[PDB]
Amino acid sequence: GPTPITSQDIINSFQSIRQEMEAYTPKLTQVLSSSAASSTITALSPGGA
Protein backbone atom coordinates (compact mmCIF):
# COMPACT_ATOMS: atom_id res chain seq x y z
CA GLY A 1 0.00 0.00 0.00
CA PRO A 2 1.04 3.63 0.47
CA THR A 3 3.75 2.53 2.91
CA PRO A 4 7.11 3.19 1.20
CA ILE A 5 10.20 1.02 0.81
CA THR A 6 24.85 -11.36 -3.41
CA SER A 7 23.31 -14.73 -4.23
CA GLN A 8 26.28 -16.52 -2.65
CA ASP A 9 25.80 -14.30 0.41
CA ILE A 10 22.61 -16.20 1.26
CA ILE A 11 24.53 -19.46 0.85
CA ASN A 12 27.32 -18.24 3.12
CA SER A 13 24.86 -16.99 5.74
CA PHE A 14 22.66 -20.08 5.49
CA GLN A 15 25.54 -22.48 6.14
CA SER A 16 27.32 -20.28 8.70
CA ILE A 17 24.17 -19.93 10.81
CA ARG A 18 23.53 -23.67 10.50
CA GLN A 19 26.80 -24.22 12.39
CA GLU A 20 26.05 -21.50 14.96
CA MET A 21 23.86 -23.41 17.43
CA GLU A 22 25.56 -26.79 17.82
CA ALA A 23 26.10 -25.53 21.38
CA TYR A 24 23.05 -24.49 23.41
CA THR A 25 21.99 -23.36 26.88
CA PRO A 26 24.88 -20.93 27.55
CA LYS A 27 22.61 -18.93 29.84
CA LEU A 28 24.77 -19.32 32.95
CA THR A 29 27.07 -16.40 32.07
CA GLN A 30 26.91 -15.77 28.33
CA VAL A 31 23.38 -14.32 28.19
CA LEU A 32 24.16 -11.26 30.32
CA SER A 33 27.02 -9.51 32.09
CA SER A 34 26.84 -7.00 34.93
CA SER A 35 28.91 -4.38 33.11
CA ALA A 36 26.52 -4.37 30.15
CA ALA A 37 23.58 -4.62 32.56
CA SER A 38 24.60 -1.52 34.51
CA SER A 39 24.77 0.62 31.37
CA THR A 40 21.25 -0.41 30.36
CA ILE A 41 19.71 0.85 33.61
CA THR A 42 21.49 4.19 33.24
CA ALA A 43 20.11 4.51 29.71
CA LEU A 44 16.62 3.90 31.10
CA SER A 45 17.22 6.83 33.47
CA PRO A 46 15.58 10.14 32.50
CA GLY A 47 18.90 11.51 31.28
CA GLY A 48 19.84 8.23 29.65
CA ALA A 49 19.28 7.07 26.10
Binding site: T25, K27, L28, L32, S34, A37, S38, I41, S45
Partner: protein, 390 residues
Protein backbone atom coordinates in the same frame (compact mmCIF):
# COMPACT_ATOMS: atom_id res chain seq x y z
CA UNK B 1 -0.81 -16.03 56.33
CA UNK B 2 2.55 -17.34 55.15
CA UNK B 3 3.82 -13.76 54.86
CA UNK B 4 3.27 -13.27 58.59
CA UNK B 5 5.31 -16.41 59.26
CA UNK B 6 8.36 -15.43 57.21
CA UNK B 7 8.13 -11.82 58.38
CA UNK B 8 8.89 -12.79 61.96
CA UNK B 9 12.32 -14.31 61.34
CA UNK B 10 15.90 -13.24 61.97
CA UNK B 11 18.30 -12.36 59.13
CA UNK B 12 20.47 -15.32 60.07
CA UNK B 13 17.74 -17.91 59.58
CA UNK B 14 16.35 -16.18 56.48
CA UNK B 15 19.35 -16.65 54.19
CA UNK B 16 19.81 -20.20 55.47
CA UNK B 17 16.10 -20.71 54.82
CA UNK B 18 16.67 -19.45 51.26
CA UNK B 19 17.59 -22.93 50.10
CA UNK B 20 18.57 -23.44 46.49
CA UNK B 21 15.77 -25.77 45.30
CA UNK B 22 12.53 -23.95 46.04
CA UNK B 23 12.57 -21.34 48.81
CA UNK B 24 13.96 -18.69 46.46
CA UNK B 25 10.96 -19.56 44.26
CA UNK B 26 8.18 -20.09 46.81
CA UNK B 27 8.88 -16.75 48.48
CA UNK B 28 8.80 -15.19 45.01
CA UNK B 29 5.16 -16.09 44.33
CA UNK B 30 4.27 -14.41 47.64
CA UNK B 31 5.45 -11.08 46.21
CA UNK B 32 2.00 -9.60 45.50
CA UNK B 33 2.10 -7.16 42.58
CA UNK B 34 5.32 -5.22 41.94
CA UNK B 35 8.15 -6.78 43.94
CA UNK B 36 8.12 -9.64 41.43
CA UNK B 37 8.98 -7.25 38.60
CA UNK B 38 11.64 -5.39 40.59
CA UNK B 39 13.20 -8.72 41.58
CA UNK B 40 13.78 -9.80 37.97
CA UNK B 41 15.17 -6.42 36.92
CA UNK B 42 17.95 -6.48 39.54
CA UNK B 43 18.62 -10.19 39.02
CA UNK B 44 21.57 -9.88 36.61
CA UNK B 45 23.14 -6.81 38.27
CA UNK B 46 26.33 -7.04 40.31
CA UNK B 47 26.36 -3.29 41.06
CA UNK B 48 24.07 -1.74 43.71
CA UNK B 49 21.96 1.20 42.61
CA UNK B 50 20.85 4.37 44.44
CA UNK B 51 17.65 4.32 46.49
CA UNK B 52 16.24 7.37 44.68
CA UNK B 53 15.84 5.48 41.40
CA UNK B 54 13.53 2.88 42.95
CA UNK B 55 11.32 5.58 44.47
CA UNK B 56 10.92 7.40 41.14
CA UNK B 57 10.32 4.22 39.09
CA UNK B 58 6.62 4.20 40.08
CA UNK B 59 4.30 6.93 38.84
CA UNK B 60 2.74 9.37 41.29
CA UNK B 61 -0.54 7.46 41.13
CA UNK B 62 -0.58 4.18 43.06
CA UNK B 63 2.62 5.28 44.80
CA UNK B 64 1.45 3.45 47.93
CA UNK B 65 1.94 0.08 46.22
CA UNK B 66 5.62 0.99 45.90
CA UNK B 67 6.14 1.75 49.59
CA UNK B 68 4.37 -1.38 50.83
CA UNK B 69 6.33 -3.54 48.38
CA UNK B 70 9.69 -2.06 49.39
CA UNK B 71 8.83 -2.33 53.08
CA UNK B 72 7.63 -5.90 52.66
CA UNK B 73 10.86 -7.02 50.99
CA UNK B 74 13.13 -5.03 53.32
CA UNK B 75 11.85 -7.24 56.13
CA UNK B 76 12.55 -10.24 53.91
CA UNK B 77 16.01 -8.68 53.40
CA UNK B 78 16.18 -9.68 49.74
CA UNK B 79 18.50 -6.71 49.15
CA UNK B 80 20.74 -4.39 51.15
CA UNK B 81 21.30 -0.66 50.68
CA UNK B 82 25.11 -1.06 50.74
CA UNK B 83 25.41 2.73 50.77
CA UNK B 84 19.97 -1.88 46.68
CA UNK B 85 21.63 -4.97 45.23
CA UNK B 86 20.01 -8.28 46.12
CA UNK B 87 21.54 -10.83 48.45
CA UNK B 88 24.22 -12.69 46.45
CA UNK B 89 23.04 -16.02 47.87
CA UNK B 90 19.45 -15.26 46.88
CA UNK B 91 20.62 -13.82 43.56
CA UNK B 92 22.63 -16.97 42.87
CA UNK B 93 19.92 -19.30 44.17
CA UNK B 94 17.17 -17.49 42.27
CA UNK B 95 19.22 -17.56 39.07
CA UNK B 96 19.62 -21.30 39.62
CA UNK B 97 15.83 -21.27 39.96
CA UNK B 98 15.62 -19.41 36.62
CA UNK B 99 17.39 -21.31 33.82
CA UNK B 100 20.37 -22.32 35.94
CA UNK B 101 21.91 -25.23 37.78
CA UNK B 102 -4.64 -38.45 41.86
CA UNK B 103 -8.39 -38.90 42.40
CA UNK B 104 -7.72 -41.40 45.19
CA UNK B 105 -5.18 -39.13 46.89
CA UNK B 106 -7.69 -36.34 47.54
CA UNK B 107 -10.15 -38.88 48.94
CA UNK B 108 -7.40 -40.16 51.23
CA UNK B 109 -6.71 -36.57 52.29
CA UNK B 110 -10.45 -35.99 52.67
CA UNK B 111 -10.83 -39.21 54.66
CA UNK B 112 -7.71 -38.84 56.81
CA UNK B 113 -8.59 -35.27 57.74
CA UNK B 114 -12.17 -36.27 58.52
CA UNK B 115 -11.12 -38.94 61.03
CA UNK B 116 -8.82 -36.42 62.73
CA UNK B 117 -11.80 -34.12 63.27
CA UNK B 118 -13.82 -37.10 64.50
CA UNK B 119 -11.16 -37.66 67.16
CA UNK B 120 -11.12 -33.91 67.79
CA UNK B 121 -14.81 -34.08 68.71
CA UNK B 122 -16.05 -36.59 71.28
CA UNK B 123 -16.48 -39.35 68.70
CA UNK B 124 -16.42 -42.82 70.34
CA UNK B 125 -14.93 -44.36 67.17
CA UNK B 126 -11.82 -42.61 65.86
CA UNK B 127 -8.26 -43.29 64.78
CA UNK B 128 -5.90 -43.82 67.72
CA UNK B 129 -2.43 -42.27 67.75
CA UNK B 130 -0.65 -41.19 70.93
CA UNK B 131 1.67 -38.84 69.04
CA UNK B 132 -1.26 -37.17 67.28
CA UNK B 133 -3.26 -36.71 70.49
CA UNK B 134 -0.42 -35.10 72.45
CA UNK B 135 0.48 -32.90 69.47
CA UNK B 136 -3.06 -31.50 69.41
CA UNK B 137 -3.01 -31.20 73.21
CA UNK B 138 0.14 -29.06 73.01
CA UNK B 139 -1.26 -27.34 69.91
CA UNK B 140 -3.34 -25.21 72.29
CA UNK B 141 -6.72 -26.58 71.14
CA UNK B 142 -6.98 -29.52 73.56
CA UNK B 143 -6.32 -30.24 77.23
CA UNK B 144 -6.39 -33.63 78.96
CA UNK B 145 -5.04 -33.13 82.51
CA UNK B 146 -5.67 -36.87 82.99
CA UNK B 147 -3.89 -39.45 80.78
CA UNK B 148 -6.33 -42.22 81.70
CA UNK B 149 -9.41 -40.28 80.63
CA UNK B 150 -9.58 -39.16 76.97
CA UNK B 151 -8.76 -35.46 76.60
CA UNK B 152 -11.62 -32.99 76.30
CA UNK B 153 -11.90 -30.01 73.93
CA UNK B 154 -10.96 -26.52 75.09
CA UNK B 155 -12.71 -23.31 74.07
CA UNK B 156 -10.22 -22.73 71.26
CA UNK B 157 -10.93 -26.23 69.96
CA UNK B 158 -14.52 -25.42 69.04
CA UNK B 159 -13.54 -22.23 67.20
CA UNK B 160 -10.96 -24.23 65.25
CA UNK B 161 -13.56 -26.91 64.54
CA UNK B 162 -15.97 -24.58 62.74
CA UNK B 163 -13.26 -23.06 60.53
CA UNK B 164 -13.07 -24.01 56.87
CA UNK B 165 -10.69 -26.81 55.93
CA UNK B 166 -8.10 -24.55 54.21
CA UNK B 167 -7.96 -22.09 57.11
CA UNK B 168 -8.39 -24.99 59.53
CA UNK B 169 -5.47 -26.91 58.03
CA UNK B 170 -3.23 -23.88 57.47
CA UNK B 171 -3.55 -22.75 61.08
CA UNK B 172 -2.96 -26.32 62.22
CA UNK B 173 0.34 -26.53 60.34
CA UNK B 174 1.22 -23.08 61.69
CA UNK B 175 1.14 -24.39 65.26
CA UNK B 176 3.16 -27.43 64.18
CA UNK B 177 6.06 -25.23 63.07
CA UNK B 178 5.98 -23.17 66.27
CA UNK B 179 5.87 -26.37 68.33
CA UNK B 180 8.57 -27.92 66.13
CA UNK B 181 11.16 -25.55 67.60
CA UNK B 182 9.95 -26.24 71.15
CA UNK B 183 10.39 -29.99 70.70
CA UNK B 184 13.80 -29.27 69.17
CA UNK B 185 13.00 -30.00 65.52
CA UNK B 186 14.88 -27.67 63.19
CA UNK B 187 12.44 -25.17 61.69
CA UNK B 188 14.37 -24.45 58.49
CA UNK B 189 14.65 -28.05 57.30
CA UNK B 190 10.96 -28.84 57.82
CA UNK B 191 9.82 -25.49 56.41
CA UNK B 192 11.71 -25.91 53.13
CA UNK B 193 9.85 -29.16 52.44
CA UNK B 194 6.45 -27.45 52.40
CA UNK B 195 7.58 -25.02 49.69
CA UNK B 196 9.09 -27.84 47.62
CA UNK B 197 5.72 -29.60 47.83
CA UNK B 198 3.96 -26.79 45.95
CA UNK B 199 6.08 -27.37 42.84
CA UNK B 200 17.05 -37.28 58.02
CA UNK B 201 15.54 -38.19 61.39
CA UNK B 202 13.51 -34.98 61.55
CA UNK B 203 12.38 -35.32 57.93
CA UNK B 204 11.16 -38.89 58.44
CA UNK B 205 9.39 -37.94 61.67
CA UNK B 206 8.12 -34.74 60.05
CA UNK B 207 6.94 -36.67 56.99
CA UNK B 208 5.31 -39.23 59.28
CA UNK B 209 3.26 -36.46 60.91
CA UNK B 210 2.40 -35.05 57.49
CA UNK B 211 1.35 -38.52 56.36
CA UNK B 212 -0.79 -38.69 59.50
CA UNK B 213 -2.62 -35.43 58.72
CA UNK B 214 -3.48 -36.83 55.29
CA UNK B 215 -1.40 -34.42 53.21
CA UNK B 216 0.94 -37.10 51.81
CA UNK B 217 0.77 -40.85 51.20
CA UNK B 218 3.76 -43.04 50.36
CA UNK B 219 1.49 -45.89 49.13
CA UNK B 220 4.56 -48.20 49.07
CA UNK B 221 4.99 -49.25 52.71
CA UNK B 222 6.69 -45.98 53.68
CA UNK B 223 9.09 -45.68 50.76
CA UNK B 224 11.34 -42.73 49.99
CA UNK B 225 9.07 -41.53 47.18
CA UNK B 226 5.86 -39.76 48.20
CA UNK B 227 2.85 -38.50 46.24
CA UNK B 228 1.46 -35.37 47.92
CA UNK B 229 -2.29 -34.90 48.13
CA UNK B 230 -4.14 -31.76 47.07
CA UNK B 231 -4.07 -30.36 50.60
CA UNK B 232 -0.28 -30.76 50.53
CA UNK B 233 0.13 -27.98 47.97
CA UNK B 234 -1.67 -25.54 50.27
CA UNK B 235 -17.05 -27.81 47.02
CA UNK B 236 -20.84 -27.37 46.89
CA UNK B 237 -22.80 -26.62 50.04
CA UNK B 238 -25.49 -28.83 51.55
CA UNK B 239 -27.23 -27.05 54.45
CA UNK B 240 -30.67 -25.58 53.75
CA UNK B 241 -31.79 -22.88 56.19
CA UNK B 242 -35.44 -21.98 56.73
CA UNK B 243 -36.92 -18.83 58.24
CA UNK B 244 -38.16 -20.71 61.35
CA UNK B 245 -34.72 -21.76 62.63
CA UNK B 246 -34.81 -25.14 60.88
CA UNK B 247 -31.82 -26.66 59.07
CA UNK B 248 -32.12 -29.39 56.44
CA UNK B 249 -28.63 -30.72 55.68
CA UNK B 250 -27.91 -33.39 53.06
CA UNK B 251 -25.14 -34.98 55.12
CA UNK B 252 -23.99 -38.60 55.10
CA UNK B 253 -20.63 -38.06 56.82
CA UNK B 254 -21.04 -38.15 60.59
CA UNK B 255 -18.59 -35.24 60.87
CA UNK B 256 -21.01 -32.73 59.35
CA UNK B 257 -23.84 -33.88 61.62
CA UNK B 258 -21.55 -33.63 64.64
CA UNK B 259 -20.55 -30.08 63.67
CA UNK B 260 -24.17 -28.97 63.19
CA UNK B 261 -25.20 -30.48 66.52
CA UNK B 262 -22.69 -28.17 68.23
CA UNK B 263 -25.04 -25.19 67.83
CA UNK B 264 -28.45 -26.70 67.06
CA UNK B 265 -30.90 -29.35 68.26
CA UNK B 266 -31.18 -32.38 66.00
CA UNK B 267 -34.70 -33.64 65.26
CA UNK B 268 -34.60 -36.27 62.50
CA UNK B 269 -31.80 -38.09 60.66
CA UNK B 270 -32.70 -39.46 57.24
CA UNK B 271 -30.28 -41.58 55.17
CA UNK B 272 -29.38 -38.60 52.96
CA UNK B 273 -30.70 -35.78 55.17
CA UNK B 274 -30.99 -34.53 58.74
CA UNK B 275 -33.31 -31.98 60.39
CA UNK B 276 -32.00 -29.63 63.07
CA UNK B 277 -33.36 -26.56 64.85
CA UNK B 278 -31.35 -23.50 65.92
CA UNK B 279 -32.93 -22.77 69.31
CA UNK B 280 -31.70 -20.50 72.10
CA UNK B 281 -30.60 -23.54 74.09
CA UNK B 282 -28.19 -24.76 71.42
CA UNK B 283 -26.77 -21.43 70.26
CA UNK B 284 -26.04 -20.17 73.77
CA UNK B 285 -24.57 -23.59 74.54
CA UNK B 286 -22.19 -23.12 71.62
CA UNK B 287 -21.48 -19.54 72.69
CA UNK B 288 -20.75 -20.72 76.24
CA UNK B 289 -18.17 -23.23 75.02
CA UNK B 290 -16.28 -20.38 73.35
CA UNK B 291 -17.70 -20.01 69.85
CA UNK B 292 -18.89 -16.63 68.59
CA UNK B 293 -21.75 -15.91 66.20
CA UNK B 294 -19.40 -15.07 63.32
CA UNK B 295 -18.17 -18.65 62.89
CA UNK B 296 -21.69 -20.10 62.85
CA UNK B 297 -22.91 -17.63 60.23
CA UNK B 298 -19.75 -18.25 58.21
CA UNK B 299 -20.05 -22.01 58.75
CA UNK B 300 -23.69 -21.98 57.66
CA UNK B 301 -22.88 -19.60 54.80
CA UNK B 302 -19.98 -21.66 53.44
CA UNK B 303 -22.01 -24.89 53.60
CA UNK B 304 -25.00 -23.30 51.86
CA UNK B 305 -27.12 -25.50 49.63
CA UNK B 306 -27.38 -24.28 46.01
CA UNK B 307 -31.14 -23.79 46.41
CA UNK B 308 -30.67 -20.80 48.73
CA UNK B 309 -27.80 -19.34 46.69
CA UNK B 310 -30.29 -17.61 44.39
CA UNK B 311 -31.69 -15.44 47.18
CA UNK B 312 -29.57 -12.49 48.30
CA UNK B 313 -28.34 -12.58 51.02
CA UNK B 314 -27.87 -16.35 50.93
CA UNK B 315 -28.70 -16.64 54.62
CA UNK B 316 -32.12 -15.12 55.42
CA UNK B 317 -31.72 -11.92 57.47
CA UNK B 318 -33.80 -13.09 60.44
CA UNK B 319 -31.68 -16.19 61.07
CA UNK B 320 -28.48 -14.15 60.91
CA UNK B 321 -29.95 -11.37 63.06
CA UNK B 322 -31.30 -13.78 65.67
CA UNK B 323 -27.97 -15.60 66.00
CA UNK B 324 -26.10 -12.33 66.53
CA UNK B 325 -28.59 -11.18 69.16
CA UNK B 326 -28.33 -14.42 71.13
CA UNK B 327 -24.57 -14.07 71.60
CA UNK B 328 -24.89 -10.38 72.51
CA UNK B 329 -27.26 -11.13 75.38
CA UNK B 330 -24.73 -13.53 76.90
CA UNK B 331 -22.10 -10.79 77.30
CA UNK B 332 -24.48 -8.04 78.44
CA UNK B 333 -22.66 -7.98 81.79
CA UNK B 334 -19.03 -7.36 80.82
CA UNK B 335 -16.75 -8.37 83.70
CA UNK B 336 -13.41 -6.59 84.11
CA UNK B 337 -11.16 -7.00 87.13
CA UNK B 338 -10.25 -3.73 88.81
CA UNK B 339 -9.69 -1.80 92.02
CA UNK B 340 -11.88 1.13 93.08
CA UNK B 341 -10.86 4.35 94.83
CA UNK B 342 -12.78 6.32 97.45
CA UNK B 343 -12.43 9.40 99.65
CA UNK B 344 -10.49 11.77 97.39
CA UNK B 345 -9.78 14.80 99.56
CA UNK B 346 -8.78 16.90 96.54
CA UNK B 347 -9.47 16.53 92.83
CA UNK B 348 -5.99 17.76 91.88
CA UNK B 349 -4.39 14.63 93.33
CA UNK B 350 -7.11 12.53 91.69
CA UNK B 351 -6.46 14.26 88.36
CA UNK B 352 -2.69 13.84 88.75
CA UNK B 353 -3.16 10.14 89.51
CA UNK B 354 -5.47 9.88 86.49
CA UNK B 355 -2.78 11.36 84.24
CA UNK B 356 -0.22 8.96 85.73
CA UNK B 357 -2.56 6.01 85.14
CA UNK B 358 -3.27 7.14 81.58
CA UNK B 359 0.45 7.40 80.85
CA UNK B 360 1.03 3.88 82.18
CA UNK B 361 -2.25 2.52 80.78
CA UNK B 362 -3.27 1.23 84.21
CA UNK B 363 -6.58 3.10 84.11
CA UNK B 364 -9.57 1.14 82.83
CA UNK B 365 -12.36 3.62 83.59
CA UNK B 366 -12.66 7.01 85.30
CA UNK B 367 -15.49 9.16 86.67
CA UNK B 368 -14.70 12.87 86.95
CA UNK B 369 -18.14 13.77 88.29
CA UNK B 370 -17.92 11.22 91.12
CA UNK B 371 -14.12 11.59 91.48
CA UNK B 372 -13.33 7.89 91.22
CA UNK B 373 -11.71 5.41 88.85
CA UNK B 374 -10.91 1.71 88.47
CA UNK B 375 -7.47 0.12 88.06
CA UNK B 376 -6.61 -3.47 87.19
CA UNK B 377 -4.81 -5.49 89.89
CA UNK B 378 -1.67 -5.48 87.74
CA UNK B 379 -1.57 -1.68 87.87
CA UNK B 380 -2.71 -1.69 91.49
CA UNK B 381 0.87 -2.26 92.65
CA UNK B 382 2.13 0.55 90.40
CA UNK B 383 -0.41 3.08 91.68
CA UNK B 384 0.06 1.79 95.23
CA UNK B 385 3.81 2.32 94.85
CA UNK B 386 3.10 5.79 93.48
CA UNK B 387 0.85 6.57 96.45
CA UNK B 388 3.52 5.39 98.89
CA UNK B 389 6.16 7.52 97.15
CA UNK B 390 3.82 10.53 97.42
Amino acid sequence: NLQEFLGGLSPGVLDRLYGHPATCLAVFRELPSLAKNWVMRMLFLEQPLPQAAVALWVKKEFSKAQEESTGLLSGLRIWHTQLLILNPIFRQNLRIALLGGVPSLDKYAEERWEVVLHFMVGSPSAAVSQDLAQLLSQAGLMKSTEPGEPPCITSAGFQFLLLDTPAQLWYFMLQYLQTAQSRGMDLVEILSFLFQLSFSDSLLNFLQHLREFGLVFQRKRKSRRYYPTRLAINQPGFIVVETNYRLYAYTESELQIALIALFSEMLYRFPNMVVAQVTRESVQQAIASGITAQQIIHFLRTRAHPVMLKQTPVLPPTITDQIRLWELERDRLRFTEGVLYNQFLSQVDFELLLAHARELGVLVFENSAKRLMVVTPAGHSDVKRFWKRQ
